[PDB]
Amino acid sequence: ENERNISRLWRAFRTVKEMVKDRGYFITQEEVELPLEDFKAKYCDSMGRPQRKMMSFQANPTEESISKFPDMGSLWVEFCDEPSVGVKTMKTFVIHIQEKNFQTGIFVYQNNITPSAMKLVPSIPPATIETFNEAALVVNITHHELVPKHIRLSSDEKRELLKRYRLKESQLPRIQRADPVALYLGLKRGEVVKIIRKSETSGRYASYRICM
Amino acid sequence: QQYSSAPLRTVKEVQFGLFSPEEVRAISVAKIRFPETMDETQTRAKIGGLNDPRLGSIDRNLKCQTCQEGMNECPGHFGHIDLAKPVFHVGFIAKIKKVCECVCMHCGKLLLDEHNELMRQALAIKDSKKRFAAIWTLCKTKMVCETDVPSEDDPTQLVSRGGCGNTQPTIRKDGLKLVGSWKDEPELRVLSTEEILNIFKHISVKDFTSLGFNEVFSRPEWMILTCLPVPPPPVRPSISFNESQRGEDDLTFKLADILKANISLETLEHNGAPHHAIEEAESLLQFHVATYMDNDIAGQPQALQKSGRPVKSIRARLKGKEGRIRGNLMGKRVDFSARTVISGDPNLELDQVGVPKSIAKTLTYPEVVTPYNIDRLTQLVRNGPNEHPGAKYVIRDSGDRIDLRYSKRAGDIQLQYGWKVERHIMDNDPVLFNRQPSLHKMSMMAHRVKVIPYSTFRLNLSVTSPYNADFDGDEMNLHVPQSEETRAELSQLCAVPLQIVSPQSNKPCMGIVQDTLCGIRKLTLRDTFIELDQVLNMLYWVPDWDGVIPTPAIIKPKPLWSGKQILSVAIPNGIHLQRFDEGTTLLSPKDNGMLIIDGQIIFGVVEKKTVGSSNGGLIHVVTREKGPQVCAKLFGNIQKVVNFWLLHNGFSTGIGDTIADGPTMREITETIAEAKKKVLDVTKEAQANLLTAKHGMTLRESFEDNVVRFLNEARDKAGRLAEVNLKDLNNVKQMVMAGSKGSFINIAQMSACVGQQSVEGKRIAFGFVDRTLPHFSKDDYSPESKGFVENSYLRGLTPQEFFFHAMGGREGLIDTAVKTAETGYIQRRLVKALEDIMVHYDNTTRNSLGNVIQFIYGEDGMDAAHIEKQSLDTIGGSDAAFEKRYRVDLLNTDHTLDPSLLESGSEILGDLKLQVLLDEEYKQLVKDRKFLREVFVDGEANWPLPVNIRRIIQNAQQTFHIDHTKPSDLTIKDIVLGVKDLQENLLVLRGKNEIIQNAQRDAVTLFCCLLRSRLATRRVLQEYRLTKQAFDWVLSNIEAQFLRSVVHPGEMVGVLAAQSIGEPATQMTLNKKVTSGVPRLKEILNVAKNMKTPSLTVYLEPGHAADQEQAKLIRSAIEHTTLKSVTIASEIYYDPDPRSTVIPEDEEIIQLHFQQSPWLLRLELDRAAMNDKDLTMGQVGERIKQTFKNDLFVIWSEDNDEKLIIRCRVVREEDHMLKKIENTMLENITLRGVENIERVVMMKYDRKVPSPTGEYVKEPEWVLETDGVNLSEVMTVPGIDPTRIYTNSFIDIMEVLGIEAGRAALYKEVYNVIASDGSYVNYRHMALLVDVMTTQGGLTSVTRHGFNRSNTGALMRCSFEETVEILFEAGASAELDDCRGVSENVILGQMAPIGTGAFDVMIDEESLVKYM
Amino acid sequence: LKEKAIPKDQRATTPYMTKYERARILGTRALQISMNAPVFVDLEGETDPLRIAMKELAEKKIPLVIRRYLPDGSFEDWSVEELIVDL
DNA sequence: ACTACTTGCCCCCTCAT
DNA sequence: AAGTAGT
RNA sequence: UCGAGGAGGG
Ligand SMILES: *CCc1ccc2ccc(OC)cc2c1
């Protein structure tokens, strides 16, 4: 009853580790398949109640991610225990970000980030902050039948795409910035995603969309 | 028409803009001061005041006094009118007001600065119109023109900005005036046009360029009219219906109105001007200038002519189907056209058109006089216009044109080289033939003229199907090309034989029809034998006959030929067809199937499946193998032998062909009897409350759903009872077997029973109170009351059956009529939305902006006409039968290549390196089996692909006389490396970089899986028995037909896709029960926000396919319910003792759940309804209690107490608080389930899935269907498969799963709309449409709100809808039109950059001397 | 610009002639032949200018170049003599 | 939440400026 | 009238 | 020679 609610949080913790692994950070497959029991074994208090500030974690880029993107900085993933994120925990996490000096910071909120806290979202450039609702994270949408492989292209990969097809970026298919998968990849504006989907005319077809 | 020395060019760009008054006064050739059109003495002169004061001609005298040219030249010259006061341009009052709200008045300055943040980011919007929308949104509410602003460095000490002080007014539109208010009461002043003019004239150049305007082409100040251009007479011409009478145009009068009001305002200004008296003569001048451009203004009286009818505004001229754009530019009336009734002809070739002589004497082609034709043309001129092979006109180089009807010299014209002769249409002239409506490109096709008598166009009957032409009185159109190169465009692109195999359905679109199809079965019958006397006639009837009488199958007492034998004389050599119909063996005992070898029929009755528009039929094969022209001759030769034989065999159909033959009737009525007895049983059931409803369905709905199935399941039984009783001589059965006309239901309704009539799905409703007709007692649900027709058409309907059947027929006719406007308009929106899409010379599929829609057309780069459905032999069967077929183990004496199959057989046993090759071959075939089962999940193997390899190999087996005995001279290196080498020659793209080369392996992947699956070593050696000869030849043919199958850059894929979808939408005789094709397609194409059947298909977790209880648990887990669904009644009592109770049935359960309010709320719940949803009174009360927390003291009876009661009291003077708490409980609060989910049905879908052995097995699973969508919530439910869930609401799929998944669901839905009506449309058309709708990032509706708001050129967008408003914004924003859109070059009369215009043709001087 | 002309040793389009190229060549030629233009083949009795153009194309004695435009103004020139003519 | 909107193949007679 | 875009 | 309205055809 209270027990069935903690399972959903565990499912979102999973989908977060999958999203971090996919974006290009060093996460193992063991950390992803963190089983059901071992979650409450680590993040539950004496009463068996999930303590969320324990769940936050840093993540570093993989070797080949730094080879493909040298400036892929380190990422920090803070969770909040209070179901309404006050502006006090925001400036705590925010000054945390520039203090430890990160590039990307992901904030998972339980129910509602106030209009006061979300004011400090673009307050630490050149670093970006993404805000994720907990319930939209229980299922990884990318595991769906209809969601094909999305791959973030490098600045040189995209420059080569535009050259080899004689294209201005206006002539490229577009992906919305608020698109679920673009949010999943932390897709920023102008970044081109390469979409590999299976086909029935050919075996496999490669399309590209650009952000906004 | 006359020669001009000016250089002739084509329009490259159209630069839109607005007229400055100065430029009008500049190009003005007259002042235009008097409304008098005429000399005022009516002396047939025109006054120096309005009509021709230097403006052009209305007479036959060298006029256009500026041009000295006279009409047919001097296109018209403009004058001006200086307006006495500025007036609005009616088309910009909306934008003027919008600009008025962005700028300060009395200070021409933008309200919001770069000192504002949201502004400086809206300022950076690269688009012009969208930036103006963001600026107007940010500025419509800043009302104070601020003069200083908090700086970027410190909000304390702020920064100045040279700002207006004054407050900005709140503006509102009243009629054609703009009124505003300021800032204890307000003040309202109307804004004078001159005030707005002076403020616009002071707007900074950066500010209005930020507002989307153009410093040189369209300043904002020019939306206000100061000097008004006067169009010349050719825009508003006169009329001469008598002599001393001339009717002036509506526009000339409306101008005279403007001029009258202007002179009134000018004298009132120049004189003593009473303020009110002149400030309403101005309102009248504004009214006339407004209604002169638009007289269809909203919320205003129309400007009415003397006769009451409104004056046609200029906007009215361009807008609408019959306006300027739609009815004069995108479509025209044309010369050199003809139309008459059509008829059929068994004796015309497929690509001929019969032209009556009277039309051939009228239509005329201009032939240039060359030494090759001067003799023939000179003879045609001698015959003149009265005999058929003659001519009408002769054009000399001078230009003046000789009329052979009248010219005195028509006898002795001696022609000269270079002269044109306009000769009559003669035999074999290519002409364009069309029947309307023209839905797909095959509705217009190029034929060969054959001049004939009798006033009717004559068609070959195999060409009826693409035109949708019958001979019940149709007319068809004929257009005669006039250039030597438009004839070439017809004969080399639009010719009928080229259009046989259509890209819409990758199958033929022409077949053997009607008489010839019915007769080719009777002729093909096994016991159909032809005598010698008749054989020789059938042979001489085939024109391409070789003169070799074939040896008769029967010699014996008398020589007899078979029907198959003689028909085979029409089948050319090199043709191989195999088709097993059903229980077909190679012995074909039922003469079933089809086996043609080298163009000779070996067995099988010939019918629709062989010679129709069938997928693998004879026509699709001959067309691919031998060519368009050989297949076109194949039609004529079959329609000549079969038609001749049928002419002498005869064929009829009588009323005896409907006789049910005695006892079969007796056994039919018995069948209807025991059916009318089953419904009377279920009636006494449902009348005694004994039947039980299935979930989510009324007891009554469940009842009628039963009864209907009982009835028309028995109609079909009597149907098959008569189909089986009908002998094989029954001529109707003969036509159903040949596939020429008729179907099962036809025999059923004509001979056995008609069946239940239906309206709107259900049976005949109670139009009267409780009965269908006054000849019936009330509450009569019997079959013969609700519209079951028990009698056959042979026996005859009763007045009741007759009237019910009439109701059902009217529903179909209404459906047709109500839907034709919809299908026709959907067709147009599709075409106009895809029109500018074609394949360019890099295989990318782009629109007129160069925007990529598809990187490779159809994701494979193939012409849909060069594609056949072949099977992928490497996806099914056991994992073992796979190994038995494909595995070769040179290191194993049981699994090696047998030495009988090839000559190096014994010396390769144990070859380790060769086994290394065959091992990597086998690992590639198993990699392919993996890939194929990932792509095609359900195991389907038959998929349309470019090269029919089965025929390409049967050809080799025949061409090379391959015996299944001798061993092949192939080596495993030959096969393995020959195929590995062949693949890198199957080329689509050709760039020299890893992007394009990867795109190549992508576009070629699936075909190569088929190739390796069919050219595997053991297959080539043990099944095909190929030779290094035949094998090398198969490889060269595969490479050839592959390269032939790629699309040609220039294919107007867009229109093809639109027509390929819209035309099946026409044939949809429509309508879990979900919204059907034509309405659902209207839903999809419009991006319908609130669709009609928002179902949701939820698959459950993998390890729960058969767990029915798990499915029941998820049903209860998601299916919504409220307290109302289980509440019988609620009552309010005065029970003021919280410890006692007045209602004695509540005496118990009161000391059991052992200050408050004395007022009791008492609910009674339904035991049955609680049990449908699993009761648990504790859950209900616990939810109510946790719904109100401390405020509401709640107790309830236990889960099996006889009556189910919940008592409720408030806790620490109105008592209507409880009255509102009641419906708060009944309506608001929920019990369990997801919001917006209503019904939830469990259906057990079939599902193919691979056995552990390998082969696919039916392993059905329980699935929940749904009424209502909440994807984000149902998704996160435990126990379901969150990666197989699907919704027909793709708008939701796009919002939860992304744009890509939305594209996939959008295709899945359009595909379901076509497939639900049995139709097949190839992937790439539906795919291309879905890609257009998704390429901009979201769901772009095929709608004047979606695609027509793109950045395509203004002329293209205005050719759809919202024409004049689009041209107005184009003028204000100074749009530039590339003229890359096809619609632009159509408007401009230029060769469009499509097809034969996708390139230029250059002459090369150096090759011009190499050849001489 | 006129760096719009892709050089010959860098052409990447198809080496085959398209339906529309062939139809526009046979039409253009039959038009010029019909306007008394020099013919580069033995007529051998042919008198229809289209059948003459089909004979010139059969022998690759047509002196015309097809300028294939790419979606940016880039273009490749191809002689009819180069282009393979399956159909 | 209400209002402003646009827009729904080809092919004889009667009437009245 | 349907249906949506905009106030 | 200007248009609008009605009635029909596949
Ligand atoms: C003029 C367009 C057109 C032709 C034929 C049609 C047939 C039936 C329907 O409605 C079901 C639509 C049509 C539209």
Ligand SMILES: [Mg+2]
């Ligand atoms: Mg008809």
Ligand SMILES: [Zn+2]
């Ligand atoms: Zn002139």
